[PDB]
């Protein structure tokens, strides 16, 4: 499904992303926007045999298993298909584990490029959270 900006913000808040490890809700809303336009079914093939899945485009080479990616480590110990669900539960759990690594949200290039250091709070402003 394709979430509405505010709808996703509320959902992310419900899923505990606001201030998770020091990252305000805006960061996640902005990251989701640039990575997939709030689309849970978004996918992307990479030069290697890996694919990015979901609203936060998580990679199958390191974070999830799709049963057809060379060098899969499945850090999130989850089927990549779970990251394409209309229910964001799995994508959030994995995002939290990813951000729990030393490089925080820097794991998402789009976030660094389009959100890092910006007034991310603007992404949830106007919403009724």
């Amino acid at each position, epitope marked *: 499904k394709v979430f509405g900006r505010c709808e996703l913000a509320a959902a992310m808040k419900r899923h505990g992303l606001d201030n998770y490890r020091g990252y305000s809700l805006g960061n996640w809303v902005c990251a989701a926007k640039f990575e997939s336009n709030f689309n849970t079914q978004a996918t992307n093939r990479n030069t290697d045999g890996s694919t990015d899945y979901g609203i936060l485009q998580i990679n199958s080479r390191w974070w999830c298993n799709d049963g057809r990616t060379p060098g899969s480590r499945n850090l999130c110990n989850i089927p990549c298909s779970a990251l394409l669900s209309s229910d964001i539960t799995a994508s959030v759990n994995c995002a939290k*584990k990813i951000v729990s690594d030393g490089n925080g949200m820097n794991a998402w290039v789009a976030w660094r490029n389009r959100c890092k250091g910006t007034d991310v709070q603007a992404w949830i402003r106007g919403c009724r959270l």
Partner: antibody
Amino acid sequence: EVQLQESGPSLVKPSQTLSLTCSVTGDSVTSDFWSWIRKFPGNKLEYMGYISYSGSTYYHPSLKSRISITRDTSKNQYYLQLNSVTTEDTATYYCASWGGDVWGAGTTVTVSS
Amino acid sequence: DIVLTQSPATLSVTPGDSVSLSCRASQSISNNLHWYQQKSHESPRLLIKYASQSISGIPSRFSGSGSGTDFTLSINSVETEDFGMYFCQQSNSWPYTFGGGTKLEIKR
């Protein structure tokens, strides 16, 4: 399935270093984040710290300076080092996955002279 | 550091009765609260993650609810093998911290 096992000296003298090994079986040590948790005498649990895939580590500030967590990819094990211990470091030490789905049986380490 | 306060310190029940355990956070932690069970001579076992998410392989009588600073672990009809310690743990901020635990004991 993945299983963890702690091992190491069960007795450490005050001021010396405590060392523990966690052997990972069933999966690679580089395919998950790993941590150390200790349980003091009165059901007091302390999350000592963890090591993530990038090698980055997070240590409990109470411990900060004394603790070090490392891993060995060829042996598929990760370790805990805690310097200058005192009797207050006597506890049951556990290694576990960051997710908390897998835990070792735990091993007691006593600090005494 | 975030402080987690669990109450009551101890709870005595008869197998078959249902119970509710409380865990309060000194700061809001959204849904980043986890529940662990630890029996005597055994290591901790994860029962509920992120406040209310069920763990495949964990008995259905265990469920969790709450958000922010108020959480609850519920056990519908406590079974004989369910007695022991129960701890909550937050992963919202480093360092991760544990509650003091609640001891579930047998009533007689």
